Design an enzyme around this catalytic site. Structure first.
Site, short mmCIF file in Angstrom:
data_model
loop_
_atom_site.label_atom_id
_atom_site.label_comp_id
_atom_site.label_asym_id
_atom_site.label_seq_id
_atom_site.Cartn_x
_atom_site.Cartn_y
_atom_site.Cartn_z
N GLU A 105 0.85 -1.23 0.00
CA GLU A 105 0.00 0.00 0.00
C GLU A 105 0.87 1.27 0.00
O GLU A 105 0.31 2.37 0.18
CB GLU A 105 -0.95 0.01 1.21
CG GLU A 105 -1.95 -1.14 1.22
CD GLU A 105 -3.07 -1.05 0.20
OE1 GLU A 105 -3.55 0.08 -0.05
OE2 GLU A 105 -3.46 -2.10 -0.34
N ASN A 156 -0.26 -8.24 6.14
CA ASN A 156 0.01 -7.87 7.56
C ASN A 156 -1.00 -8.58 8.48
O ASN A 156 -2.08 -9.03 8.03
CB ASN A 156 0.08 -6.36 7.75
CG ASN A 156 -1.26 -5.66 7.78
OD1 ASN A 156 -2.16 -6.05 8.50
ND2 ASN A 156 -1.37 -4.60 7.00
N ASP A 186 8.17 0.65 16.63
CA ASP A 186 6.79 0.66 16.06
C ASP A 186 6.23 -0.76 15.96
O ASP A 186 5.66 -1.14 14.89
CB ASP A 186 6.72 1.36 14.70
CG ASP A 186 5.29 1.64 14.23
OD1 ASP A 186 4.38 1.68 15.08
OD2 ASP A 186 5.09 1.78 13.00
N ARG A 244 0.31 -4.24 12.21
CA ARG A 244 0.53 -3.71 10.83
C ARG A 244 1.98 -3.95 10.38
O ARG A 244 2.20 -3.98 9.15
CB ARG A 244 0.20 -2.21 10.72
CG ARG A 244 1.16 -1.27 11.44
CD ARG A 244 0.74 0.20 11.43
NE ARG A 244 1.38 0.91 12.54
CZ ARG A 244 0.82 1.13 13.73
NH1 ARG A 244 -0.42 0.74 13.97
NH2 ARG A 244 1.50 1.73 14.69
N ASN A 245 2.91 -4.15 11.32
CA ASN A 245 4.36 -4.34 11.03
C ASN A 245 4.75 -5.80 11.25
O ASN A 245 5.95 -6.08 11.36
CB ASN A 245 5.22 -3.36 11.84
CG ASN A 245 5.05 -1.95 11.34
OD1 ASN A 245 4.86 -1.75 10.14
ND2 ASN A 245 5.06 -0.97 12.23
N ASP A 301 10.10 -4.11 9.17
CA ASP A 301 10.36 -2.66 9.35
C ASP A 301 11.13 -2.46 10.66
O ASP A 301 10.90 -1.45 11.32
CB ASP A 301 9.06 -1.86 9.29
CG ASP A 301 9.26 -0.40 8.91
OD1 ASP A 301 10.42 -0.02 8.60
OD2 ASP A 301 8.27 0.34 8.94
C1 LIG Z 1 15.00 -3.38 2.83
C2 LIG Z 1 13.72 -3.13 3.59
O1 LIG Z 1 12.67 -3.96 3.11
C3 LIG Z 1 11.41 -3.90 3.64
C4 LIG Z 1 11.06 -3.00 4.66
C5 LIG Z 1 9.76 -2.99 5.16
C6 LIG Z 1 8.82 -3.88 4.65
C7 LIG Z 1 9.15 -4.77 3.64
C8 LIG Z 1 8.11 -5.70 3.15
C9 LIG Z 1 6.81 -5.23 2.93
C10 LIG Z 1 5.79 -6.08 2.48
C11 LIG Z 1 6.07 -7.43 2.27
C12 LIG Z 1 5.34 -8.54 1.83
N1 LIG Z 1 4.03 -8.71 1.46
C13 LIG Z 1 3.08 -7.78 1.36
O2 LIG Z 1 3.32 -6.61 1.50
C14 LIG Z 1 1.65 -8.18 1.03
C15 LIG Z 1 0.62 -7.25 1.18
C16 LIG Z 1 -0.71 -7.58 0.88
C17 LIG Z 1 -1.03 -8.86 0.44
C18 LIG Z 1 -0.02 -9.80 0.29
C19 LIG Z 1 1.31 -9.47 0.59
N2 LIG Z 1 6.10 -9.65 1.80
N3 LIG Z 1 7.36 -9.18 2.22
C20 LIG Z 1 7.38 -7.89 2.49
C21 LIG Z 1 8.38 -7.05 2.93
C22 LIG Z 1 10.45 -4.78 3.16
CL LIG Z 2 -3.10 -0.38 11.89
#
Ligand SMILES: CCOc1cccc(-c2ccc3c(NC(=O)c4ccccc4)n[nH]c3c2)c1
Ligand SMILES: [Cl-]
Length: 288
Positions: A22, A104, A151, A155-156, A169
């Site tokens: 998102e 999440n 945090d 959600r995280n 995160d």
């Molecule tokens: C180098 C930093 O990398 C980051 C930092 C913060 C978050 C992420 C991150 C975010 C979302 C995801 C994710 N999957 C999803 O975001 C997701 C969302 C809705 C429906 C299905 C899957 N799989 N792995 C992730 C890793 C990666």
């Molecule tokens: Cl939330």
């Protein structure tokens, strides 16, 4: 940037796909990694790729590099989002991390609420406690590596195809009125000493973990619904504590209250929460 041959994957081994989170965690995309494992070069792995947006600043780039460097330092655990590789040379920086296909934990819990809405999956009492245990284990690992999350919230936490909980995160190091993608106020997860005195410790993460337990047992409930920032401050000064959710044992509510100790030194540690949650899982029924 310099080539780190620990983590380098050739750009042509990555097939970029559709966006994911998102925008909450910046520009993150689903991709397929060919031969991510040097041991297995004909296998594709679904992965998440973080990159810079079009109008990205120099700071924005600095933050991405910082986040990747922290993840190398912190090392691997089952219950965190793990670094898998990077494309640093000859194009835009790509940081490759584990993909969690069920999104999440807030979304995951809300989607499995009992009918009003008719869901395809439903969670036992054991499943809910097991969720809590997995987050506590990830947090115990991060604390052991001297990482303060700042945090911690459903959600995280991300959920894999195999229902594994993964803290996200944790690699990044404040507008109290800025809301989430979902419209909630992050200040509602903050320990009073973090909120009032800007003091962040493993003990303030345990307070957040208390709010996360409350989110789990409300199946993705919103803490302090309709409460603005100024009213939240007054609630915390008066020592208000959220009500016990229905379908939550006296033992889990007391764990929540212990996480919310006014005195940071008197809260349990993640080591203590892991041991307690381990015992409770084994004694919790999966029959409802
Ligand atoms: C180098 C930093 O990398 C980051 C930092 C913060 C978050 C992420 C991150 C975010 C979302 C995801 C994710 N999957 C999803 O975001 C997701 C969302 C809705 C429906 C299905 C899957 N799989 N792995 C992730 C890793 C990666
Ligand atoms: Cl939330």
């Amino acid at each position: 940037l310099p080539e780190d041959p620990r983590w380098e994957l050739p750009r042509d081994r990555l097939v970029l796909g559709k966006p994911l989170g998102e925008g909450a965690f910046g520009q993150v995309v689903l991709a397929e990694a060919i031969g991510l494992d040097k041991d297995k070069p004909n296998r594709v792995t679904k992965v998440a790729v973080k990159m810079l947006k079009s109008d990205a600043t120099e700071k924005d780039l600095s933050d991405l590099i910082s986040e990747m460097e922290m993840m190398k330092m912190i090392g691997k655990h089952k219950n965190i989002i793990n670094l898998l590789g990077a494309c640093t040379q000859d194009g835009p920086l790509y940081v490759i991390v584990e993909y969690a296909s069920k999104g999440n934990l807030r979304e995951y819990l809300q989607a499995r609420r009992p009918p009003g809405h008719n869901p395809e999956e439903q969670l036992s009492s054991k499943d809910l406690v097991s969720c809590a245990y997995q987050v506590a284990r990830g947090m115990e690992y991060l604390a052991s590596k001297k990482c303060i999350h700042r945090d911690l919230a459903a959600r995280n936490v991300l959920v894999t195809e195999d229902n594994v909980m993964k803290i996200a995160d944790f690699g990044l190091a404040i507008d109290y009125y800025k809301k989430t993608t979902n419209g909630r106020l992050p200040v509602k997860w903050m320990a009073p000493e973090a909120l009032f005195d800007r003091i962040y410790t493993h003990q303030s993460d345990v307070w957040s973990f208390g709010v996360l337990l409350w989110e789990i047992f409300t199946l993705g409930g919103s803490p302090y619904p309709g409460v603005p920032v100024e009213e939240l401050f007054k609630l915390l000064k008066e020592g208000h504590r959220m009500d016990k959710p229905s379908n939550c044992t006296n033992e889990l509510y007391m764990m929540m209250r212990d996480c919310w100790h006014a005195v940071p030194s008197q809260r349990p540690t993640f080591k203590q929460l892991v041991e307690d949650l381990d015992r409770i899982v084994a004694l919790t029924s999966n029959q409802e």
